[PDB]
Design a protein around this ligand. Structure first.
Ligand SMILES: [Zn+2]
Length: 26
């Protein structure tokens, strides 16, 4: 599951999510 738990969100997209995690960790 490509969910982004830290911001209580969820994705099924591997690209969008992985791009999201890198900005999450800054
Ligand atoms: Zn997020």
């Amino acid at each position: 599951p490509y969910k982004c738990s830290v911001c209580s969100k969820a994705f099924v997209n591997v690209g969008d999510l992985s791009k999201h995690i890198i900005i999450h960790t800054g």
